[PDB]
Design a protein around this ligand. Structure first.
Ligand code: OLA
Ligand code: OLA
Ligand code: OLA
Ligand code: OLA
Ligand code: NAG
Ligand code: NAG
Ligand code: CA
Ligand code: CA
Lengths: 293, 293
């Protein structure tokens, strides 16, 4: 409902969201927006674990708006049982599969409001696999008639597409018992570990659904979703996969799991994937991690 | 409250460790067989900060003090289970601050009994400093009739919120916090550390010091949690000494913030020198980074 200001760094945006947990980023969920000729498809942004639409997209969303897209973002996976779930603005703690249902409702609203046939979708971290749930289980895709898919492009950053070894926690990654973390961390934390039930089910039979064009971006220095290459997808029949290492061609971009959202290079990569025939400017600028290394 | 963790050299790995073992002791600490030597006859008691514990706070300071020849002791205090943050593992000192003095009294008595010593020296990080001052003022850490028999001889602090904080790291967002809505979320300790809070008012009423105590009060120019940083400094009352130290004086490359610099070699030297004035302690000057970029 309220609109917060444009941001350039993740933790300031998070702090703002902790006092305004339902805020929208600039340029987002204007339900009067009409797709243009250059950009027929609305863009749906899907946040990550313990995050919201504001702290995830307070830079990406304004940039996509200035580029001429209609931009939309939901908040999802909200629950109040886990400890972290009780903190303001930490969403997407609920077990992940039903996220696809929430996304479906939202996407229907967006299509309904814009008269477009399809949307494009960007997902951060859990967002990505939440989006894939929608693709696989909740009608994002149409197995019998791929051309009718409601999602045309899935773009993701840091997505835990095949779970994470949590390499950044060092020796502590293995001490995490999948059974004791839900009450504290929330079930989604457990759903993103290696070979979780949800990920075995999500990946059973393949990474892709036909018709969808996937752009899967990872950062070398991501230490939340690890090894970082596990984010990459393998194309199945009738699908396209472009896996991008954020650093190939720009080693001075040191984005991590969080700072990648405020990297001008990542925004460029996203805009490129959204407008492949458009000569998009993909910068190569420095960007730092959140922590000092 | 007796598993011993490894020495650490960075704060966040220590905090992570503690989250899986929230009663861990830093090395060299709470050996109740330890007898103070003649060169260092006072035990050292370490008092942690808000949302912290003895491990993440002193997993560097304690091993270093132990190798310098002190008997080292540390407690966890201010544990409550009503606030949301208070429910997370190893985030202690969320309870309202004043009564922490009482816990410290208990602990100090067990230390004196265990070692035959007349006094202790004490070190406090952030809330630990004013919690320590609570003990000094309201729970018998000082003796008005006979200051010579104060149970505490030295109080050394770092980043202590001795006169409350403006939270300048939050910029204009700090003015947006409502002191009545944060207790349930962050713990009453957070509200007690705000400027002119009831607790700080009663604690500082009538002066910063008690007779017979030597105060070494350290702040860092880059501390942006206990702000303005100079507010930590104390004014000497009657029968008291205050040595107000800015960590960056004589070493502008030490860029420690509120958390790092618990892991600064310079800070550790400063504390060792305050403990051993006549001992020609080496105080290095070395580069140390903030926790964030
Ligand atoms: C150093 C990497 C360790 C693994 C990363 C784990 C935490 C990453 C969280 C990213 C989202 C924003 C953080 C806010 C919620 C913190 C909860 C937590 O620390 O588990
Ligand atoms: C993208 C998936 C991210 C999952 C990361 C979750 C783990 C990161 C570590 C967080 C600190 C450890 C949390 C401690 C909770 C233990 C609770 C318990 O079982 O008692
Ligand atoms: C949902 C209830 C809203 C009321 C406020 C909730 C606060 C959540 C945000 C906290 C940001 C950090 C505030 C830091 C104050 C700590 C004071 C200190 O450590 O000295
Ligand atoms: C969770 C363990 C951390 C212990 C203390 C945490 C401090 C939380 C307070 C945040 C409000 C202050 C604004 C942050 C500025 C960061 C600069 C610094 O750390 O010195
Ligand atoms: C995406 O990753 C798969 C394997 O994980 C690889 O076969 C494929 O070539 C990659 N695609 C691109 C465009 O890099
Ligand atoms: C801090 O202590 C110094 C001595 O180190 C003293 O001269 C000064 O007055 C004190 N500062 C304050 C604000 O009391
Ligand atoms: Ca919630
Ligand atoms: Ca503190």
């Amino acid at each position: 409902d309220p609109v917060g200001p444009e941001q350039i760094s993740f933790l300031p945006a998070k702090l703002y969201s902790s006092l305004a947990p339902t805020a929208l980023p600039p340029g987002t969920n204007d339900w009067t927006c009409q797709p243009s000729a250059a950009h027929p498809r609305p863009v749906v942004l899907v946040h990550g674990t313990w995050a919201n639409r504001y702290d995830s997209f307070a830079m990406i969303a304004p940039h996509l708006k200035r580029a001429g897209y209609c931009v939309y973002a939901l908040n999802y996976g909200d629950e109040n049982v886990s400890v972290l779930g009780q903190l303001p603005g930490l969403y997407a703690t609920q077990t992940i599969k039903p996220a696809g249902g929430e996304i479906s409702s939202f996407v229907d609203q967006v299509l309904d409001s814009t008269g477009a046939d399809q949307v494009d979708m960007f997902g951060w971290s859990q967002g990505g696999i939440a989006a894939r749930s929608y693709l696989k289980f909740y009608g994002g895709t149409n197995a019998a008639n791929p051309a009718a898919n409601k999602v045309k492009n899935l773009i993701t950053f840091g997505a835990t597409n095949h779970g994470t070894t949590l390499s950044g926690l060092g020796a502590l990654a293995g001490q995490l018992a999948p059974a004791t973390i839900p009450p504290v961390l929330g079930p989604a934390a457990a759903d993103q570990l290696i070979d979780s039930p949800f990920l075995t089910e999500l990946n059973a039979g393949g990474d892709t659904q036909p018709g969808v064009t996937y752009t899967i971006i990872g950062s070398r220095y991501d230490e939340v979703s690890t090894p970082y290459q596990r984010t990459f997808l393998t194309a199945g029949p009738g699908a396209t996969v472009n896996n991008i290492t954020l650093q190939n061609g720009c080693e001075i971009d040191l984005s991590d799991h969080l700072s990648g959202l405020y990297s001008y290079r990542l925004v460029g990569l996203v805009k490129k994937a959204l407008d492949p025939t458009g000569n998009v400017y993909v910068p190569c600028l420095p960007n730092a991690p959140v922590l000092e290394h």
